[PDB]
Amino acid sequence: GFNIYTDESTLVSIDAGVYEHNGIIWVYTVDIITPVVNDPYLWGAISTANALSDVYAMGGIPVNALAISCFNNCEIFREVIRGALDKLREAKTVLLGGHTIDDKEPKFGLSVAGICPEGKYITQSGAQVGQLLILTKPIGTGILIKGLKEGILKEEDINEAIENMLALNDKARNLMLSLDATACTDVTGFGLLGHAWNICKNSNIGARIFFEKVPYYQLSENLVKKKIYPKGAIENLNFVKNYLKSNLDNWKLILLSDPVTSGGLLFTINKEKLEKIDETAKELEVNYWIIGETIAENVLEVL
Amino acid sequence: GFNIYTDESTLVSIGAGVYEHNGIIWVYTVDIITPVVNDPYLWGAISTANALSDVYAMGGIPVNALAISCFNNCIEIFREVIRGALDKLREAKTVLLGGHTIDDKEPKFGLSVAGICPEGKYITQSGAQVGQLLILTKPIGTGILIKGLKEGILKEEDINEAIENMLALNDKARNLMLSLDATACTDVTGFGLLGHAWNICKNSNIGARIFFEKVPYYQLSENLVKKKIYPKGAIENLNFVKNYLKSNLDNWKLILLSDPVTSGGLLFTINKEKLEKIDETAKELEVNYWIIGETIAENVLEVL
Amino acid sequence: GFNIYTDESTLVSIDAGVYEHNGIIWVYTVDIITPVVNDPYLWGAISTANALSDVYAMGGIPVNALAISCFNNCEIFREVIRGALDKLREAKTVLLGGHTIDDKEPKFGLSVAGICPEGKYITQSGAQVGQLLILTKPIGTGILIKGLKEGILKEEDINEAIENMLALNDKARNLMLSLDATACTDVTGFGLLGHAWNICKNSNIGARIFFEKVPYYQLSENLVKKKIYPKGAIENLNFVKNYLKSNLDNWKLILLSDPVTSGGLLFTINKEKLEKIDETAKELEVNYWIIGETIAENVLEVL
Amino acid sequence: GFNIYTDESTLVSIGDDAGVYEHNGIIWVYTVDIITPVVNDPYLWGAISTANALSDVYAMGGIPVNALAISCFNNCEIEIFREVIRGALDKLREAKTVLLGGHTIDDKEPKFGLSVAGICPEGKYITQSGAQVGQLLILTKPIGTGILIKGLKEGILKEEDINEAIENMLALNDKARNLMLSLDATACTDVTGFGLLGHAWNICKNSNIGARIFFEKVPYYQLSENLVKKKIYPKGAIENLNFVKNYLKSNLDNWKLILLSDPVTSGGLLFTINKEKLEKIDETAKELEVNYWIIGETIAENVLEVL
Amino acid sequence: GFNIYTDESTLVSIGDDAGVYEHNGIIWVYTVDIITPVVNDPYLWGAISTANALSDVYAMGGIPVNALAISCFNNCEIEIFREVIRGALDKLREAKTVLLGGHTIDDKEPKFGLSVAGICPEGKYITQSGAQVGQLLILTKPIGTGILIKGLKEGILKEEDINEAIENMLALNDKARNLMLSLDATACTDVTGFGLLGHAWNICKNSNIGARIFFEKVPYYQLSENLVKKKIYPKGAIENLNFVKNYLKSNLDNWKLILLSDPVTSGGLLFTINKEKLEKIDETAKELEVNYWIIGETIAENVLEVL
Amino acid sequence: GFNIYTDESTLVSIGAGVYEHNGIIWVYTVDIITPVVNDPYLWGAISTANALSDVYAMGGIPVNALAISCFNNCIEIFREVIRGALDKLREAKTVLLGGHTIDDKEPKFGLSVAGICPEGKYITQSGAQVGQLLILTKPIGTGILIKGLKEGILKEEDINEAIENMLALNDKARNLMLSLDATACTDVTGFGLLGHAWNICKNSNIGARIFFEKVPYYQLSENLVKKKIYPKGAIENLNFVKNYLKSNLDNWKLILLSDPVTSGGLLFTINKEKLEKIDETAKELEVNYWIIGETIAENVLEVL
């Protein structure tokens, strides 16, 4: 008889993007990293957790993925894939295959596709003034990873960091969504200050972070005080310098700028949500730290 | 780098449908008819013109089509039917994509047609206004002639003018119609002139006044109807409009006006200020026209 | 360079079915009903909640839908659609259009498409012996709807039933998933006994239901005792008679077999989950009633 | 129950994303055209660039259907682009063309344009290779915009001094397309960056024929003549002239050849018609509300003559 | 950067889901064939029905690629079907054909079969309308299964009494297809429900030619002859004979015409070859490991002669 | 009622790829070459045979192709090139879908080809076993002849046999190869006989022993190489296999054996028990063959 049918879709690309089609939202991300530990299996697992986090940070549910590496261009990859498969299985994400890239520097990662149901798509631009900044994993891995490279540390010294890098941000995403977070991102290569600033620039606001409230590995502090830290840290710190307000020692600023690998989620929530955060977090079995709040002035304050 | 792409489409089916996709509008129609003349080739050509008319009436440009018939189910003759359809389609710059056989025993042939309505020019039947003139581009009365031909009362040679008109594409009429900024349009086929005029009135929530003495029809059509010679479809069309018909005209006239038409012309509404151009526009486009009436406020069909 | 790509999909049809493609699961359902109240708007809203429940019952997240009615074949539909749109908006589901059917009997409903993330697809065949039967809405609407038709009741008398028929089963789905239910279905036209039996047949087990533990409207009891009940009730009761074991009065069996409109979810959970059901249910803001347990013998016991 | 269905399509592309697509009787044309700022008004830049991009489709006898915006975005500089888009949207609305989105390009040099898709109904696909000997060359807009835009940059002229040219650059070639189709033109192209001579030569090469152009019949802004004489002209004019020097025969003063080679922005259509068509060209143009100038005729010798 | 791409496809279907599809040089054939139980062994029913369905593709010179199971399922009666599927799977594996799934039909009468898709490489698409006069008719399996399956139902015979026929019904016509293609056959069909005469007539009608069949050259089960004489035969045989009575010329005893019209299940291929091909037919068949019988020749008169 | 449908596919790209979908396997390859003869038509035909060989070598049946060249970028001659490609494609029952122009200045032409491997018969280069015989279906040494022709040392008339072999499709050879149940196969082209033999050894983790006196090559090829006349590609191929080459043969022989071949024959491995059929099978299929060696355990190339 009489029939009416409509179809609509939108694609936004910034192999990264967001796709909406008749009510469903898909997010696509790509993330590849250089070895962080001298164990192929751990590298595959960590790289996978790191890549999936791009999706979790958007409130997404990872669905499938493609392995990406410099194969042939850079037996070890067999262990790398084994580690990636285990982490993917834990994440209930399907590996659809792999793509080789032209690069001589050893790198591995994934391109991931996820879904954001009921329009629950979270960006880095919805933050408002007077909200709390919540972080779900410690920082300082960059410092530890360098310590390893310099032969100052051994893997056994940083098992806590490795355990955190291995951890999926699925529980963190659930906490973030449960508290109706207005903005979210994960903490990786740009450091805690860099990613916080990303939220500040895209939301047109500023942030106040309290160093004493930021979780980090004791060993990261010990190493940074002895001038042991990655270059990315200096690059990150300088990137926010023209917007940074702080009278804290340089080592604290370097620590806060240290490139993180497979870090936790960094998101903003209203002060009222503070009433249920601990209980919600406990039920979900995920850690959280309240590190500061957003301000109107477009600067980054650290005290 | 930063890229944004959108896509949207809508499909509206009534049977026959209209599809819009990112700015372009396609119209789809289907029309099959029983033999109207003894010549298989002419039957193919006439059915084709008749099927394309559906698209022309909507302001569309026919693009492609699919032949539909019960061949092998109702063979050497269908070769001529296709030949006629192909020649007419070539004339209409429309491509034949193939054919489909339906479950039927009664000899019938026609086409499924797909066309496009450029610049959003999609002409419907619900945009007519009161005080406009009703224009018709082809005479009526073919149903009565076809009956006579079937009855053996007439020969094809007697109705050559009707055959020429049935064979004629409504593309020039569509252009005239668009050129005069028509507010509504439809083609005249099986439901008779009154029926299709009523379709416009119904959809435009308006009325129409038609003058019998201004309606073009074949002389032979009048002679046959006066001898009680006409299609049963004429009675069906008349009885269907009688609840909305206001007229005192003799029966033969109402029957003639209700006579099912094959590959008829276009019936459309234009403003009276266009009456100054219509003649020169029609001469250039090479298409005849007849002012048969005007729209009125009262929702009825006034046949005077 | 070297590339490997795989693609796989499965389609199962019983316009109803399940579709799996590279890790994602979609469920498609169709559900249309006759008017249940003399208010077009309420009918549109209720029919919508009822149709979406087919998806919720499978653990699905409704995404989009198409309206289905006997339009032209049977101004009122304008209010029907208005009601359907409101309920769809509440459900965060997109209406893509409508399809007309050949029928002279006034009916309206939806065809719905939903998603089941992380393989969380729930059927009616995973129930095991010794599990608890949980129900999330009262039964007895069929009796009340007849009472209305017979002019014995007026809409105002059954506002509680109307409120329940209007309610989305999204919170119930969340409870059901949170408790890791092994099987689930919603309660509609086949009555509570019929749908329970559906779980029994597909899971190859039986069920024991306690009448005194089943939630139902007081007015439904009053009416059924006075021989006021729909035919579907008798049809449902007879459908399970050759598998029914009970010494309860006929009115109680008729009530339990009464066709429900937009009923709650009926699912099975392990006894241990009983420890968190109340708290979980309270957090989700959804009611629940423990009406019985599954048994090994393939019969339906009611006491 | 017998059934027979056929499907066929052909795609011919030139390079980037410019091509012709035919599918079961319908013909689609795709083009892309981006230009550097023309005037100092952001809004006018978006509007003019749009008219310019749509022209590639009109010139092929096409009806624009939809488009995609293309600009350096963030790679060149974000308040002017808002105005640029506003101008584009207004011009597209006028052209009844839908904007489907946008695409960014890595370019430090400010540029904006559109990728456009249009259709050519009833196989009315007009190319640059169907011209015959003895046909008339028709132009629908004056030339000389390059020289005026140059003078505007040299501070020699003010924005207001070229309102006539701006009005012409803003005008859609849809009416010109209709005239061209109505007169059954055998070949058509629009006049842009390559200058009148260059675009005329494109028809000559692809049609393997020649052209004879009469300078005194060519429409151009008087202000453009005033400037070329004063050595005021874009370098693109010199390049264009040099591009056609191997096939050019003329004894005219250099300033005339420079004017004729001057890069045009959003110019008119340049097409060929049979001589008999002169009988109704004037009446048709007035009805369509478009201007036209008969600037010459095609000849057999594969050369370009200007006198 | 110049590019030209073309695409074309044609689809011809007969009714249900049986047709021929051509797309840019490749030809796909689709067929569907379901039969009622043939023997009392569920496994053999699935295996035989499969060989029977695949035959529709082999007969067209095709290579089966994938299939879909089709059965009444739940509409006819669920332990036998498990065995039926097992038989189908074994036969498909042997045919190197992938089972993509299944489809249920509303039918109370027990039936099972397959929808099959295959390809005809290098345009080797063999039909029933390319036969010429003076060609030989070749058959690759005996006929008479209808009469034996009938006797099995009448309790006249035991399952074991027809192991020879069962072995032939189980055999894939892939080797026969290879022989047919190797000898450059001009037309081919398989012999099923319509009987030998009926399927031979199909070639005659579509090729607009005639056939002359020699009864003494036709291979058939001796047990089949024994039964027809005793009035033991399927009614389908009578129907088939009547279907060809308007085009049949023969003076042979009725039991011979009944045998020749007897419905066959999973029969051999019936194809036409030029007489010169007899030179290598025997050697080729032995190499391919397939049997063959020359049963007659085609003639000009559009009739069916049996002597 | 109750219906279940599944779908699955895999794509493996190496550059060139293999695609499997619900039981069918398609292979995709690409091959372009510089002019080898002065005749534009012969160049088109030879390049085509050379491009199709990639598919034949895998046991495939070519279905369609796309022409690839730098025409207009490296015109009246390319008309002859296409004519030659079209004639050869017709012979191969392969359809030309169109063409693509690449960014290159050096005159080159070839095709992108798509083919199918029926009944799962996908022949690779990693299934050879020790103790098998190495079969070659066309002589080698065309690289040296083409060099001589380019140098003006030879005329096309002098190398008509090489041209006939370059023009020949490897479809008959593929059939022979499949007929003898070959365990591995490849075609001989630019990497020379030793190079392609090594590809099989490398992928099969086996070795090969080749007898120079059993290898077919054009007499003129031997004469030219002995006069220091040969393609630079020959030196490149030889130096590439020298780390896996065990031989004491004179330089000219190794160079000849490493000489880049154009539209060469197939090189495949079969069991010695097949040596009793190969001759009659080859006569029927109408294809020449040469037993040039046998596979060995040691992972090297023994050229004796």
Curated annotation (Swiss-Prot), chains B, F:
Comment on bound cofactor: Binds 1 Mg(2+) ion per monomer.
Transferase recorded as keyword: yes
A Gene Ontology term for the protein's cellular component: cytoplasm
CDD domains, alphabetized: SelD (cd02195)
Record's keyword terms, sorted: ATP-binding, Kinase, Magnesium, Metal-binding, Nucleotide-binding, Selenium, Selenocysteine, Transferase
Binding residues for ATP: 14-15, 31, 54, 99-101
Pfam families, A to Z: AIRS (PF00586), AIRS_C (PF02769)
EC number of the protein: 2.7.9.3
InterPro entries named in the record: PurM-like_C_dom, PurM-like_C_sf, PurM-like_N, PurM-like_N_sf, SelD_I, SPS/SelD
Cofactor(s), names only, from the UniProt record: Mg(2+)
Annotated binding of Mg(2+), by residue: 54, 187
Reaction catalyzed: hydrogenselenide + ATP + H2O = selenophosphate + AMP + phosphate + 2 H(+)
Example GO biological process: selenocysteine biosynthetic process
GO-annotated molecular function: ATP binding; magnesium ion binding; selenide, water dikinase activity
First-tier enzyme category under EC: transferase
Family: Belongs to the selenophosphate synthase 1 family. Class I subfamily.
Subunit structure: Homodimer.
UniProt xrefs under PANTHER family: INACTIVE SELENIDE, WATER DIKINASE-LIKE PROTEIN-RELATED (PTHR10256:SF0), SELENIDE, WATER DIKINASE (PTHR10256)
Function: Synthesizes selenophosphate from selenide and ATP.
This protein's name: Selenide, water dikinase
Organism of this sequence: Aquifex aeolicus (strain VF5)
From Swiss-Prot, chains D, E:
Role according to the record: Synthesizes selenophosphate from selenide and ATP.
Signal peptide: none
HAMAP family: SelD
Source organism (scientific name): Aquifex aeolicus (strain VF5)
PANTHER family: INACTIVE SELENIDE, WATER DIKINASE-LIKE PROTEIN-RELATED, SELENIDE, WATER DIKINASE
One Pfam family, short name: AIRS_C
Record's subunit section: Homodimer.
Alphabetical list of Gene3D superfamilies matching this protein: PurM-like C-terminal domain, PurM-like, N-terminal domain
Reaction it catalyzes: hydrogenselenide + ATP + H2O = selenophosphate + AMP + phosphate + 2 H(+)
Cofactor(s) needed for function: Mg(2+)
GO molecular function: ATP binding; magnesium ion binding; selenide, water dikinase activity
Cofactor binding summary note: Binds 1 Mg(2+) ion per monomer.
Residues reported to bind ATP: 14-16, 33, 56, 102-104
Highest taxon in the source lineage: Bacteria
GO cellular component: cytoplasm
Family to which this protein belongs: Belongs to the selenophosphate synthase 1 family. Class I subfamily.
NCBIfam families: selD
Protein name per UniProt: Selenide, water dikinase
InterPro entries registered for this protein in UniProt: PurM-like_C_dom, PurM-like_C_sf, PurM-like_N, PurM-like_N_sf, SelD_I, SPS/SelD
Keywords: ATP-binding, Kinase, Magnesium, Metal-binding, Nucleotide-binding, Selenium, Selenocysteine, Transferase
Binding residues annotated for Mg(2+), in chain numbering: 17, 56, 190
GO biological process terms, semicolon-separated: selenocysteine biosynthetic process
